[PDB]
Amino acid sequence: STNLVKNKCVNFNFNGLTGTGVLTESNKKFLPFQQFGRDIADTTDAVR
């Protein structure tokens, strides 16, 4: 493993899903089996 860094423009890799960006605190809770969270434009913008 590595660490968990937030709030900087970083690279991430959660559950194979690759992407870069700022990992700001989230404000929405999902269903307790769901791993992702997506918008109308079908772009990943949330993850557990």
Partner: peptide, 25 residues
């Protein structure tokens, strides 16, 4: 003008779909 405005209706910018602002505010 307000009664007319109220009737008319970043995620985009994930790919380079920036939106330049108008000139006349």
């Amino acid at each position: 003008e307000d009664l007319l405005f109220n009737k008319v209706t970043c995620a985009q910018k994930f790919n380079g779909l920036t939106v330049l602002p108008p000139l006349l505010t």
